[PDB]
Design a protein around this ligand. Structure first.
Ligand SMILES: CO[C@H]1/C=C/O[C@@]2(C)Oc3c(C)c(O)c4c(O)c(c(/C=N/N5CCN(C6CCCC6)CC5)c(O)c4c3C2=O)NC(=O)/C(C)=C\C=C\[C@H](C)[C@H](O)[C@@H](C)[C@@H](O)[C@@H](C)[C@H](OC(C)=O)[C@@H]1C
Ligand SMILES: [Mg+2]
Ligand SMILES: [Mg+2]
Ligand SMILES: [Mg+2]
Ligand SMILES: [Mg+2]
Ligand SMILES: [Mg+2]
Ligand SMILES: [Mg+2]
Ligand SMILES: [Mg+2]
Ligand SMILES: [Mg+2]
Ligand SMILES: [Mg+2]
Ligand SMILES: [Mg+2]
Ligand SMILES: [Mg+2]
Ligand SMILES: [Mg+2]
Ligand SMILES: [Mg+2]
Ligand SMILES: [Mg+2]
Ligand SMILES: [Mg+2]
Ligand SMILES: [Mg+2]
Ligand SMILES: [Mg+2]
Ligand SMILES: [Mg+2]
Ligand SMILES: [Mg+2]
Ligand SMILES: [Mg+2]
Ligand SMILES: [Mg+2]
Ligand SMILES: [Mg+2]
Ligand SMILES: [Mg+2]
Ligand SMILES: [Mg+2]
Ligand SMILES: [Mg+2]
Ligand SMILES: [Mg+2]
Ligand SMILES: [Mg+2]
Ligand SMILES: [Mg+2]
Ligand SMILES: [Mg+2]
Ligand SMILES: [Mg+2]
Ligand SMILES: [Mg+2]
Ligand SMILES: [Mg+2]
Ligand SMILES: [Mg+2]
Ligand SMILES: [Mg+2]
Ligand SMILES: [Mg+2]
Ligand SMILES: [Mg+2]
Ligand SMILES: [Mg+2]
Ligand SMILES: [Mg+2]
Ligand SMILES: [Mg+2]
Ligand SMILES: [Mg+2]
Ligand SMILES: [Mg+2]
Ligand SMILES: [Mg+2]
Ligand SMILES: [Mg+2]
Ligand SMILES: [Mg+2]
Ligand SMILES: [Mg+2]
Ligand SMILES: [Mg+2]
Ligand SMILES: [Mg+2]
Ligand SMILES: [Mg+2]
Ligand SMILES: [Mg+2]
Ligand SMILES: [Mg+2]
Ligand SMILES: [Mg+2]
Ligand SMILES: [Mg+2]
Ligand SMILES: [Mg+2]
Ligand SMILES: [Mg+2]
Ligand SMILES: [Mg+2]
Ligand SMILES: [Mg+2]
Ligand SMILES: [Mg+2]
Ligand SMILES: [Mg+2]
Ligand SMILES: [Mg+2]
Ligand SMILES: [Mg+2]
Ligand SMILES: [Mg+2]
Ligand SMILES: [Mg+2]
Ligand SMILES: [Mg+2]
Ligand SMILES: [Mg+2]
Ligand SMILES: [Mg+2]
Ligand SMILES: [Mg+2]
Ligand SMILES: [Mg+2]
Ligand SMILES: [Mg+2]
Ligand SMILES: [Mg+2]
Ligand SMILES: [Mg+2]
Ligand SMILES: [Mg+2]
Ligand SMILES: [Mg+2]
Ligand SMILES: [Mg+2]
Ligand SMILES: [Mg+2]
Ligand SMILES: [Mg+2]
Ligand SMILES: [Mg+2]
Ligand SMILES: [Mg+2]
Ligand SMILES: [Mg+2]
Ligand SMILES: [Mg+2]
Ligand SMILES: [Mg+2]
Ligand SMILES: [Mg+2]
Ligand SMILES: [Mg+2]
Ligand SMILES: [Mg+2]
Ligand SMILES: [Mg+2]
Ligand SMILES: [Mg+2]
Ligand SMILES: [Mg+2]
Ligand SMILES: [Mg+2]
Ligand SMILES: [Mg+2]
Ligand SMILES: [Mg+2]
Ligand SMILES: [Mg+2]
Ligand SMILES: [Mg+2]
Ligand SMILES: [Mg+2]
Ligand SMILES: [Mg+2]
Ligand SMILES: [Mg+2]
Ligand SMILES: [Mg+2]
Ligand SMILES: [Mg+2]
Ligand SMILES: [Mg+2]
Ligand SMILES: [Mg+2]
Ligand SMILES: [Mg+2]
Ligand SMILES: [Mg+2]
Ligand SMILES: [Mg+2]
Ligand SMILES: [Mg+2]
Ligand SMILES: [Mg+2]
Ligand SMILES: [Mg+2]
Ligand SMILES: [Mg+2]
Ligand SMILES: [Mg+2]
Ligand SMILES: [Mg+2]
Ligand SMILES: [Mg+2]
Ligand SMILES: [Mg+2]
Ligand SMILES: [Mg+2]
Ligand SMILES: [Mg+2]
Ligand SMILES: [Mg+2]
Ligand SMILES: [Mg+2]
Ligand SMILES: [Mg+2]
Ligand SMILES: [Mg+2]
Ligand SMILES: [Mg+2]
Ligand SMILES: [Mg+2]
Ligand SMILES: [Mg+2]
Ligand SMILES: [Mg+2]
Ligand SMILES: [Mg+2]
Ligand SMILES: [Mg+2]
Ligand SMILES: [Mg+2]
Ligand SMILES: [Mg+2]
Ligand SMILES: [Mg+2]
Ligand SMILES: [Mg+2]
Ligand SMILES: [Mg+2]
Ligand SMILES: [Mg+2]
Ligand SMILES: [Mg+2]
Ligand SMILES: [Mg+2]
Ligand SMILES: [Mg+2]
Ligand SMILES: [Mg+2]
Ligand SMILES: [Mg+2]
Ligand SMILES: [Zn+2]
Lengths: 37, 340, 243, 95, 621, 229, 229
């Protein structure tokens, strides 16, 4: 009753994320913040 | 073997009363064996229809006999064949066993006949399961009828002659699914047995002996025979058929009427005038419309519903029990505990 | 309960043409004959060549005769009516059809003539004969001119029409289109079960599984195997979530 | 059929990839608040009992209507798995 | 058993577009119950769920506001429909529901071919995609209007079925009527005049066999496109009439209907010229020409744009069909005059065979096998006879065009109506000595009928047996083939197979070009293992050969430049469990390469299990 | 006027009773008899209003599927016969008229047996309602209304008396329409359309009346093309 | 007004230029969009009378199948191009106008080359009649009329000059008509007709104008049912 090995359940696509350029600059701002003192 | 009655309409039931099945006792032909049995054997002539069997997994193993087919002494469907001594054809008939049928040279009914005289030199006959062009001098026996070749159910089809045996089966089983309409109608074109079907089935009520009519209720026709007697004939007003189709006898005779022996006093569930009637003759154009009739779709004119044409009465018999639970008897009361 | 005819219903002649009602048209615009009488049902031709029952097309022709000639007939099994005898009654019917038309005051349409033109270019009518004579020929063939009804223009090319008997078929319990959202569940097997009032779920067979397998329908299959039928804790949180 | 399904198919390396993108985008469109879109102003999603589709009818019909434009970005490993859901909650209100 | 399921009778939905399907609101209600409940709460119709529930527990209590809620819940969601035997992946398709009254389920006609569903009581189930994901896939990669081309063959399955062709065909056919006097206008000017007046008279038709231009072309010339049809509307020219017209840059001698068809397509997809390049207006539109049209449009213009053309064809076909007034009649099945001849000629010849036996020349057997040969020949003789009849005398016989058009009809079938069905076999299999002299037009006799009946049963018995053998097979195949799944990077093992374009033995030894079919089967959408320079073009390595390319290689083998073809294939793959992009090829239901992650194993196992139902079934071994 | 306008549709009429009405109109230009006949027909059938039995109350009967003693016909056959009944009221003031009839014993019950009502008339007197034997007691109240088209008994569900039973609504007073366009020869040019349409009617309204209503519906519709947007 | 009358045909329009014009109108009862669209269409094509080249006379040419020296195009190609010509006269006084044009040598002959006529205007100036080489002499007289529908050159047979040749009559500013009846849902009942008809026009008149004229012809015809006889 597990997800099918074949299809959208492909190891090649089971993992794929999406972004808005707005959330793109938001995460890099998180990286900028990493600079200590 | 003993099954629910098939009263979707008199015809349907009647047929279900004259079916011959394979499966059953479990000791005789069961599920395994098939194809040799399932095929329409040569001898099946006048003894079994070759069109009647159920279009489905269980095919050819279940079938109703033919028109003049009769079980003689021991279950051997004999079929009537008339005698033809020399080039002379008789009105005498011999119900022959399957076996004996092969010892003779038998011919078809289509043979131009002058009475007792066969009319063409090279006229068809079939010895033993083999089509043979025989001479008028070899024609020992002749077919009794075209009707005897098939079943009743099938005999009701107009020009069977021009219809593929395959689909003709469909037409024959379709009738078995005919539902009784409050408005019955006999075909504009009939074969000839519609009368005999309703009569031999027990749809319409016929007059025993000659006399006059006394009272014509909606529930009874008390007729007065000339013998000095009168009997009340109840009419199953509205009864529940096993499959939920109405069975009502509608009186067709007025008050004070001299009845001929065996004339319809009332019509059966599906009879118009002592004739079998199902569905209703309707004027029809035979062309394509948009897509409304595309693979096997039908377009219908609203007009057909304006007149109460295809309309039919149903009856489902819901049932409930007051059971005794150890928790307390289930009471049946107008009381419905929670809301309105 | 009264069961008046409706779209879901299935009707079929004695020959085998079986079929369902797909649309109930307003008398307003369905095919209508020259004299205002319109057709009740329109059967597709296509269902006739493949299947092989011309007997129905033979019935419709005798039927047309019986309509105008106001009479029923009895055509035995194989001994019955013959093609010439029917053309004969059709001949008699042309006079009731068109004879009254002559006396009632009018002749032929622009439409009636137009379809004749396309009909002679077809090969149904002997070129050079008068419309009156031509229409008889054409009628004897079993087809008559029909106008749209929606547009009033004719239907290019004669079309046959007539009195065909047709029955209505009994509706089984299955007919009662099932449809179940949530419902009971078997005791030992935890799969959906119906009965009295809850409809009982449909079966997802292997053949169907593969159908989805073929597609990239991963979840959709999972669901069918979990959320929809056996995932005890699944279906529950499923409903609630939806809720 | 559906709007520029070809155009869509073409923007992905695999057919089955397009389907995951759209679905995951539809996911986020609703979870973090439905105004998590990139193309609302002038010509946008619309239904007609009113022009009310502007708020919440079909999730992915949006997802696709955005992916068809070149604003979104779908990668195999674009932005680290857990930090994504955090930054998204911080910036998009509506709950 | 699925929790969000349903099932009802189906009924054709002619206006419906491939995209959607008609679903009984009454059904939708139960189906989408929870989705509706909540939606009730988001509106004033109910305070809460439990409320919304009791609100609908009874039929008479529903406010017409609820439908407006449901109709709103279903906005862009879609459902799946199943058919009785689910034989291939298209046995389940997704569509957008358009809620409708009553009991029946409105199905589109074009997909009645994928599911083997006819309308004599066929009932289809219906399921609901609950997750946003299940819905995503469902409508993205499972909706009808997206899987137009079959997985078995790169041939379309969304083809104008029965009624559409019949319509589309009748509109594009041209007529020919009476040849009496001279047919020569190619040269004299006294020929134009005389045969123009002679046509005005009663002697020359509008469509006469007169090479260059039958007077029907002489009389009418149409400047712009429209001009042509207006004359038609007014009753000047039928649609099937041969006229001359001015198109973009040519004086084209083509019929009204043909010109009209041109537009239909030209309109469906507005790249008018591109509509002309992929269409053949030089012939009556058969299902094949159509089929082709579809395919072409698919590669050329693009998927959705095709969908449009599909419905466009569906629409006009349907309409034009109704107006055409094609009908079945008893006099329309026409029996040839030659039938009597052929019969009698073969009749007397039977007499000879008999005199030849009465004497002792031919053995018991010889007689028999000689008689059958007489009929088998004679029967085939009437068959080409009837056709010739219609072909020459009634080009527009009802019963005819249907068969010609990819519409409906089988040569063998026609023969049974107009010609005659001649030989039926005995119970066992030994065919009968006597034929069935009759046709269905005339009374198939009492017994010739009983004779033909036998063979009917064997057909039926066979059919009932494949309703499960059709599965028998597919099971086996899927048991071995399920694991096979496209998961890859171009597998680096280049071991390849060579496809033969020539066969050695039909007639002992003669090398011959394989049939366009098989070849198409072998190289369609394959990946060239090695580079091949053939007629002038350099097919590079690894390239996916389009049907247009596979059409080049054959034209090249015709010329004599290649006898084999290097191409990747499943038989030579390296991916243990799985097959790769380059080795599978093209055919997803879509015409581009295969997309990684497609369940080929089964797609395959299926395409092979269905047709199996058509193959004969006497004894396994 | 004399030339093109005097050459105007000679509207001629032939009407017997309120059922049949033929209507000729010629000359007309090219293909106009059709242009007019067809719309009018479409209107004459779908558009025009009338009368039909909308509800019935037998006094001892509760459901439609019952049978009354001394009465040969069954409830369902009778309610059917009522649909056959054609009434005609004369003014708007009469929207819903309840006709009453009670007959006993050995008599045949025809439509003339209904007690007369002031503004209403029964065109269908001799229609057959029932055949009463002896001790035949039939007392009913049959509602009647003015509406348009067909309305299934299910759709309206009329409620005069709780034990009453609704009937289907056959509101088109028009029975059938028919039109012919034969050629007419007027001096100069032969091509001419002569439109004559034959109208049949249940009696409620008249062929002429109907026709008039029809043309108006069309007219009213042609005006709906006024305000662009 | 508020209930049944406010629920009235919302007549909406969309017209770009003088050629195309869509016209929507809903709601309509049952099967009315058809009832209306169809007649209007039949009128829009046959009735909205117009103009078309009815006859031509090349001076040296006798038959229609001839070819003129220095003239690339053949008589048949040119008479065809003339059918393409759209003219517009302003008043009834102009029933049959003969336009004249004569051009010589290395010039291209377009419709603007015809000598202007007082009450007549040519909307099709740049249309291409012929290409004259050298020593190219073309002097013609092309007749023009006001009529309705399509009339084959055979049907009229015009006779200005004995060596002239008739041309087919394309009498209409309207190019094509088209109407669709799609369902529309208005609250209670779903069954609803939505009539939208698309009209194309050569420019002479506008879609709207045409439509208006159309409806009137219908109206005018509905009035012809007045005086019985
Ligand atoms: C002895 O009672 C039972 C024994 C079972 O055991 C078992 C093993 O032994 C059997 C026999 C010995 C039989 O002789 C037999 C039949 O003769 C038969 C069918 C089955 N027919 N069905 C198949 C489904 N279709 C449907 C149409 C749409 C698709 C599905 C309709 C016809 C069948 O399976 C049979 C059967 C068995 O299975 N029928 C027909 O010949 C036929 C073609 C039509 C008749 C239809 C009537 C309507 C029907 O008669 C009805 C009144 C009932 O009588 C039956 C249901 C009955 O049930 C009860 C309870 O009484 C059983 C026969
Ligand atoms: Mg993930
Ligand atoms: Mg065994
Ligand atoms: Mg055993
Ligand atoms: Mg059989
Ligand atoms: Mg089976
Ligand atoms: Mg089995
Ligand atoms: Mg015994
Ligand atoms: Mg015999
Ligand atoms: Mg004789
Ligand atoms: Mg002997
Ligand atoms: Mg019968
Ligand atoms: Mg009757
Ligand atoms: Mg008799
Ligand atoms: Mg007594
Ligand atoms: Mg007694
Ligand atoms: Mg009784
Ligand atoms: Mg009871
Ligand atoms: Mg007496
Ligand atoms: Mg008597
Ligand atoms: Mg009635
Ligand atoms: Mg009736
Ligand atoms: Mg019902
Ligand atoms: Mg009659
Ligand atoms: Mg009648
Ligand atoms: Mg009559
Ligand atoms: Mg006669
Ligand atoms: Mg005569
Ligand atoms: Mg059943
Ligand atoms: Mg429950
Ligand atoms: Mg059970
Ligand atoms: Mg129940
Ligand atoms: Mg339930
Ligand atoms: Mg919880
Ligand atoms: Mg926007
Ligand atoms: Mg984007
Ligand atoms: Mg990772
Ligand atoms: Mg938050
Ligand atoms: Mg629809
Ligand atoms: Mg409802
Ligand atoms: Mg419920
Ligand atoms: Mg409440
Ligand atoms: Mg309300
Ligand atoms: Mg069906
Ligand atoms: Mg059935
Ligand atoms: Mg099913
Ligand atoms: Mg000759
Ligand atoms: Mg020759
Ligand atoms: Mg020639
Ligand atoms: Mg030439
Ligand atoms: Mg030559
Ligand atoms: Mg010619
Ligand atoms: Mg040739
Ligand atoms: Mg040339
Ligand atoms: Mg081409
Ligand atoms: Mg071409
Ligand atoms: Mg050709
Ligand atoms: Mg050809
Ligand atoms: Mg149409
Ligand atoms: Mg002859
Ligand atoms: Mg010979
Ligand atoms: Mg032998
Ligand atoms: Mg040949
Ligand atoms: Mg021949
Ligand atoms: Mg030919
Ligand atoms: Mg023919
Ligand atoms: Mg013979
Ligand atoms: Mg016969
Ligand atoms: Mg690899
Ligand atoms: Mg090799
Ligand atoms: Mg080789
Ligand atoms: Mg050879
Ligand atoms: Mg050899
Ligand atoms: Mg050889
Ligand atoms: Mg070959
Ligand atoms: Mg090499
Ligand atoms: Mg090498
Ligand atoms: Mg080379
Ligand atoms: Mg090269
Ligand atoms: Mg390369
Ligand atoms: Mg190739
Ligand atoms: Mg090549
Ligand atoms: Mg070559
Ligand atoms: Mg493939
Ligand atoms: Mg594939
Ligand atoms: Mg075996
Ligand atoms: Mg005058
Ligand atoms: Mg008079
Ligand atoms: Mg009179
Ligand atoms: Mg006039
Ligand atoms: Mg006029
Ligand atoms: Mg006129
Ligand atoms: Mg009506
Ligand atoms: Mg109305
Ligand atoms: Mg009134
Ligand atoms: Mg009382
Ligand atoms: Mg008064
Ligand atoms: Mg008054
Ligand atoms: Mg008054
Ligand atoms: Mg008033
Ligand atoms: Mg009053
Ligand atoms: Mg009152
Ligand atoms: Mg009283
Ligand atoms: Mg009275
Ligand atoms: Mg009084
Ligand atoms: Mg009063
Ligand atoms: Mg009388
Ligand atoms: Mg008494
Ligand atoms: Mg009401
Ligand atoms: Mg009600
Ligand atoms: Mg009450
Ligand atoms: Mg009624
Ligand atoms: Mg009435
Ligand atoms: Mg009528
Ligand atoms: Mg007004
Ligand atoms: Mg006004
Ligand atoms: Mg606007
Ligand atoms: Mg209104
Ligand atoms: Mg706008
Ligand atoms: Mg302007
Ligand atoms: Mg030249
Ligand atoms: Mg010169
Ligand atoms: Mg020239
Ligand atoms: Mg030229
Ligand atoms: Mg030329
Ligand atoms: Mg100028
Ligand atoms: Mg113009
Ligand atoms: Mg639509
Ligand atoms: Mg719209
Ligand atoms: Mg309202
Ligand atoms: Mg209301
Ligand atoms: Mg327009
Ligand atoms: Mg005027
Ligand atoms: Zn590989």
């Amino acid at each position: 009753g597990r997800l099918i090995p074949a299809g959208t359940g492909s190891d090649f696509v089971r993992f794929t994320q999406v972004v808005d350029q707005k959330t793109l600059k938001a995460i890099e701002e998180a990286r900028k913040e990493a600079v200590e003192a | 073997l003993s099954q629910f009655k098939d009263e979707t309409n008199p015809l349907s039931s009647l047929r279900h009363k004259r079916r011959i099945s394979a499966l059953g006792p479990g000791g005789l032909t069961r599920e395994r064996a098939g194809f040799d049995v399932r095929d329409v054997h040569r001898t099946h002539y006048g003894r079994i229809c070759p069109v009647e069997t159920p279009e489905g997994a269980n095919i050819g193993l279940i079938t109703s006999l033919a028109a003049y087919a009769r079980v003689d002494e021991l279950g051997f469907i004999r079929t009537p064949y008339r005698r033809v001594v020399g080039g002379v054809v008789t009105d005498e008939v011999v119900y022959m066993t399957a076996t004996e049928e092969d010892r003779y040279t038998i011919a078809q009914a289509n043979t131009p006949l002058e009475g007792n005289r066969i009319a063409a030199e090279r006229v068809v006959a079939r010895r033993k399961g083999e089509p043979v062009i025989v001479s008028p001098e070899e024609v020992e026996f002749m077919d009794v009828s075209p009707k005897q070749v098939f079943s009743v159910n099938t005999n009701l089809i107009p020009f069977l002659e021009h219809d593929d045996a395959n689909r003709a089966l469909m037409g024959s089983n379709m009738q078995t699914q005919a539902v009784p309409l409050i408005r019955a109608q006999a075909p504009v074109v009939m074969t000839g047995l519609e009368e005999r079907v309703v009569r031999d089935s027990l749809a319409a009520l016929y007059a025993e002996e000659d006399g006059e009519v006394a009272k014509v209720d909606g529930n009874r026709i008390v007729v007065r025979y000339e013998d000095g007697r009168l009997v009340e004939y109840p009419l199953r007003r509205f009864y529940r058929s096993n499959q939920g189709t109405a069975l009502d006898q509608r009186p067709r005779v007025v008050v004070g009427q001299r009845v001929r022996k065996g004339d319809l006093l009332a019509d059966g569930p599906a009879s118009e005038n002592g004739f079998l009637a199902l569905g209703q003759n309707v004027l029809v154009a035979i062309m394509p419309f948009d897509g409304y009739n595309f693979e096997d779709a039908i377009v219908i004119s609203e007009e057909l519903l304006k007149r109460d044409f295809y309309t039919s009465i149903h009856i489902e018999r819901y049932e409930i029990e007051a059971r005794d639970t150890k928790l307390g008897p289930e009471r049946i009361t107008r009381d419905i505990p929670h809301l309105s | 309960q009264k069961r008046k005819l409706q779209v879901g219903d299935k009707l079929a002649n004695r020959h085998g043409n079986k079929g369902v009602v797909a649309k109930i048209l307003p008398v307003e615009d369905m095919p209508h004959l020259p004299d205002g009488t319109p057709v009740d049902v329109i059967l597709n031709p296509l269902g006739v060549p493949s299947r092989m029952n011309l007997g129905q097309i033979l019935e419709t022709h005798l039927g047309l005769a019986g309509y105008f000639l106001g009479q029923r007939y009895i055509s035995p099994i194989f001994d019955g009516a013959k093609e010439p005898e029917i053309k004969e009654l059709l001949a008699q019917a042309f006079e009731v059809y068109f004879g009254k038309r002559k006396g009632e005051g009018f002749g032929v349409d622009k439409r009636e003539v137009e379809v004749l033109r396309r009909a002679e270019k077809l090969g149904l009518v002997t070129p050079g004969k008068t419309p009156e004579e031509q229409l008889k020929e054409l009628f004897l063939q079993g087809k008559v001119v029909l106008y749209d009804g929606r547009t009033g223009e004719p239907i290019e090319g004669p079309i046959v029409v007539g009195q065909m008997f047709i029955m209505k078929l009994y509706h089984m319990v299955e007919d009662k289109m099932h449809a179940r959202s949530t419902g009971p569940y078997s005791l030992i097997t935890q799969q959906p079960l119906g009965g009295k009032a809850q409809f009982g779920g449909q079966r997802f067979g292997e053949m169907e599984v593969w159908a989805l397998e073929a597609y990239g329908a991963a979840h959709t299959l999972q669901e069918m195997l979990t959320l929809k039928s056996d995932d005890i804790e699944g279906r529950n949180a499923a409903y609630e979530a939806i809720i | 059929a559906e709007p520029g399904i070809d155009k869509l198919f073409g923007m992905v390396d695999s057919k089955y990839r397009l389907t995951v993108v759209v679905a995951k985008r539809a996911q986020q469109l609703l979870r973090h608040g439905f105004k998590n879109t990139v193309l609302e102003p002038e010509e946008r999603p619309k239904m007609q009992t009113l022009e009310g589709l502007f708020d919440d009818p079909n999730a992915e019909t949006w997802a696709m209507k955005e992916l068809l434009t070149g604003r979104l970005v779908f990668g195999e490993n674009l932005v680290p798995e857990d930090r994504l859901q955090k930054e998204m909650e911080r910036i998009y209100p509506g709950e | 058993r699925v929790d969000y399921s349903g099932r009802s009778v189906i009924v054709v939905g002619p206006q419906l577009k491939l995209h959607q399907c008609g679903l009984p609101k009454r059904m939708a209600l139960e189906l989408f119950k929870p989705f509706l409940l909540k939606k009730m709460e988001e509106k004033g119709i109910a305070p809460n769920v439990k409320a919304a529930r009791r609100m609908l527990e009874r039929q008479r209590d529903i406010k017409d506001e609820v439908w407006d809620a449901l109709e709103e819940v279903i906005h862009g969601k879609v459902v799946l429909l199943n058919r009785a035997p689910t034989l291939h992946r298209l046995g389940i398709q997704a569509f957008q529901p358009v809620l409708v009254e009553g009991q029946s389920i409105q199905l589109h006609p074009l997909v009645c071919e994928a599911f083997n569903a006819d309308f004599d009581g066929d009932q289809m189930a219906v399921h609901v995609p609950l997750s946003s994901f299940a819905q995503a896939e469902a409508r993205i990669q499972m909706l009808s209007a997206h899987n137009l081309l079959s997985p078995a063959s790169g041939e379309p399955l969304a083809k104008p079925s029965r009624d559409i062709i019949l319509g589309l065909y009748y509109i594009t056919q041209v007529r020919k009527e009476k040849k009496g006097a001279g047919l020569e206008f190619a040269t004299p000017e006294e020929a134009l005049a005389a045969h123009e007046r002679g046509e005005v008279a009663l002697n020359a038709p509008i469509k006469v066999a007169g090479r260059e231009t039958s007077v029907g072309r002489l009389k009418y010339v149409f400047a712009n496109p429209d001009e042509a049809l207006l004359a038609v509307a007014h009753g000047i020219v039928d649609l099937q009439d041969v006229v001359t017209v001015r198109y973009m840059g040519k004086r084209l001698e083509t019929s009204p209907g043909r010109i009209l068809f041109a537009r239909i397509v030209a309109e469906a997809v507005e790249d008018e010229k591109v509509a002309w390049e992929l269409i053949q207006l030089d012939v009556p539109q058969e299902k094949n020409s159509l089929k082709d049209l579809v395919y072409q449009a698919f590669l050329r213009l693009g998927m959705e744009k095709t969908a449009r053309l599909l419905d466009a064809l569906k629409y006009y076909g349907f309409t034009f069909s109704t107006t055409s007034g094609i009908t079945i009649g008893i006099d329309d099945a026409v029996i040839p005059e030659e039938k009597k001849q052929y019969l009698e000629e073969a009749d007397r010849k039977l007499l000879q065979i008999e005199q030849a036996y009465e004497m002792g020349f031919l053995t018991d057997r010889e007689r028999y096998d000689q008689i059958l040969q007489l009929w088998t020949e004679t029967t085939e003789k009437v068959t080409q006879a009837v056709f010739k009849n219609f072909e020459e005398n009634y080009p527009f016989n009802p019963l005819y065009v249907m068969a010609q058009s990819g519409a409906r009809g089988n040569p063998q079938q026609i023969r049974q109506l107009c010609g005659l069905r001649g030989l039926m076999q005995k119970p066992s299999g030994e065919t009968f000595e006597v034929p069935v002299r009759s046709s269905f037009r005339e009374g198939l006799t009492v017994l010739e009928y009983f004779i033909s009946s036998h063979g009917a049963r064997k057909g039926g018995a066979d059919t009932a047996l494949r309703t499960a053998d059709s599965g028998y097979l597919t099971r086996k195949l899927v048991d071995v083939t399920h694991e096979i799944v496209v998961r890859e990077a171009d597998c680096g093992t280049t071991n390849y197979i060579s496809v033969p374009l020539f066969q050695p033995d039909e007639v002992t030894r003669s090398l011959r070009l394989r049939k366009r079919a098989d070849i198409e089967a072998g190289l369609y959408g394959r990946v060239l293992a090695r580079e091949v320079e053939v007629l002038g073009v350099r097919l590079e390595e690894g390239r996916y050969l389009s049907m247009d390319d596979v059409h080049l290689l054959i034209k090249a083998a015709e010329a004599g430049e290649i006898q084999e073809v290097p191409v990747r294939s499943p038989l030579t793959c390296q991916t243990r469990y799985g097959v790769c992009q380059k080795c599978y090829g093209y055919d997803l239901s879509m015409a581009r390469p295969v997309s990684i992650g497609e369940a080929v194993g089964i797609v395959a196992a299926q395409s092979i299990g269905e047709p199996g139902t058509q193959l004969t079934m006497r004894t396994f071994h | 006027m004399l030339d093109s306008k005097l050459k105007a549709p000679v509207f001629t009429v032939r009407t017997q009773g309120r059922e049949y009405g033929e209507f000729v109109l010629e000359p007309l230009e090219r293909g106009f008899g059709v242009t007019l006949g067809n719309p009018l027909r479409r209107i004459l059938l779908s558009s025009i209003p009338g009368t039909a039995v909308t509800s019935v109350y037998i006094e001892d009967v509760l459901h439609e599927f019952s049978t009354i003693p001394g009465v040969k016909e069954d409830v369902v056959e009778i309610i059917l016969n009522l649909k056959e009944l054609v009434v005609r009221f004369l003014n708007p003031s009469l929207q819903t008229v309840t006709l009453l009839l009670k007959a006993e014993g050995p008599k045949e019950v025809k439509a003339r047996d209904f007690l007369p009502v002031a503004d209403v008339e029964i065109m269908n007197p001799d229609l057959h309602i029932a055949t009463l034997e002896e001790g035949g007691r039939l007392n009913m109240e049959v509602r009647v209304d003015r509406g348009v088209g067909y309305v299934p008994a299910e759709k309206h569900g009329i409620k005069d008396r709780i034990n009453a039973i609704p009937v289907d609504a056959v509101f088109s007073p028009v029975r059938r329409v028919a039109f012919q366009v034969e050629d007419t020869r007027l001096g100069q040019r032969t091509d001419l359309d002569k439109l004559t349409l034959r109208i049949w009617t249940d009696g409620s309204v008249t062929p002429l009346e109907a026709l008039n209503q029809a043309v108006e519906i069309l007219r009213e519709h042609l005006t709906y093309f006024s305000n662009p947007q």
